[PDB]
From Swiss-Prot, chain A:
Any one cellular-component term (Gene Ontology): plasma membrane
Gene: cdaA
Record has ATP-binding as a keyword: yes
One example GO MF annotation: ATP binding
Enzyme class: transferase
Role noted for this protein: One of 3 paralogous diadenylate cyclases (DAC) in this bacteria, catalyzing the condensation of 2 ATP molecules into cyclic di-AMP (c-di-AMP). Upon expression in E.coli leads to c-di-AMP synthesis. Probably the main producer of c-di-AMP for the cell; is probably implicated in control of peptidoglycan synthesis. In B.subtilis c-di-AMP is a second messenger that mediates growth, DNA repair and cell wall homeostasis; it is toxic when present in excess.
Shown part of the complete sequence: 103 to 253 of 273
Species classification: Bacteria, Bacillati, Bacillota, Bacilli, Bacillales
Official protein name in the record: Cyclic di-AMP synthase CdaA
Annotated DAC domain residues: 2-141
Length: 152, 152
């Protein structure tokens, strides 16, 4: 495997470990992975981190009632670019009516970029992904990891 | 100058984070590397290489989270790593009511020219370790003066 591929695998491991931990504890989270459409306009709305990824940092960011927990984390490649970022809210009628702003923001960014966004519900602990305007709910750990692997 | 503006922005972020943690009696340990290299201690923690912000510093030290156990080490105006090991002082001249956070700060200050800030989880008191001594019960103005003097 090349260094790029190994770095990708480490980043996917860090993300899945963090999401799994947050899902178990019903810690709401919103994590957007930039792909080929640049997200600088949204990154610039948040608090700049430009930090190396770790499962530990991702978890610490989303702890309830902390400065960084509200809004999206946006990742670029192997870095956490910014936290507490704004994303546009989708008006799609295919978002389950019981879902709140984190899911609507995720679908919203996925309507205007090729990004992949992961959402942890604070209500149920369910994990979903938004991509290309569609929300896929109730993912197993295996499904999320396979989705991430395919995105890279 | 740009360098001077950056130093002041960093001092302001630190003092804001320390004030929040003192108020809530959140234990914290923040070492600022100076001329003595601290790579061996940075390597024991979780890598961040992150931009400083008061928000990130607060999020790191929230109790019962992955990153809060150990020291943050700053280097070149960034957060190099969190949850780092520091050596415990064996000095018999540290106030006997203080525990391992303060002994770790004094310990690193015995073998480096670094400046360490400590927030007590028992009292919210703020102290600074330098040169093997611990300066206790600092006001906001005192801590700022120490940070400005360190960098002058
Ligand atoms: C180069 N500098 C640092 O590493 C630092 C840390 C805290 C306050 C100020 C500074 C300074 O800007
Ligand atoms: Mg289903």
């Amino acid at each position: 495997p090349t260094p790029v591929e190994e770095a990708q695998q480490k980043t996917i491991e860090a993300i899945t470990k963090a999401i799994n931990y947050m899902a178990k504890r019903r810690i709401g989270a919103l994590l957007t992975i930039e792909r080929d459409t640049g997200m600088g306009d949204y990154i610039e709305t948040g608090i700049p981190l430009n930090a190396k990824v770790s499962s530990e940092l991702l978890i610490n960011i989303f702890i309830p009632n902390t400065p960084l927990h509200d809004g999206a984390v946006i990742m670029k490649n192997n870095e956490i670019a910014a936290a507490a970022c704004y994303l546009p809210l989708s008006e799609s009628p295919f978002i389950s009516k019981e879902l709140g702003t984190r899911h609507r923001a995720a679908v919203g960014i996925s309507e205007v970029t090729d990004s992949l966004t992961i959402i942890v519900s604070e209500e149920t602990g369910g994990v979903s992904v938004a991509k290309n305007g569609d929300l896929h709910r109730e993912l197993t750990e295996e499904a999320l990891k396979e989705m991430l692997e395919a995105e890279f």
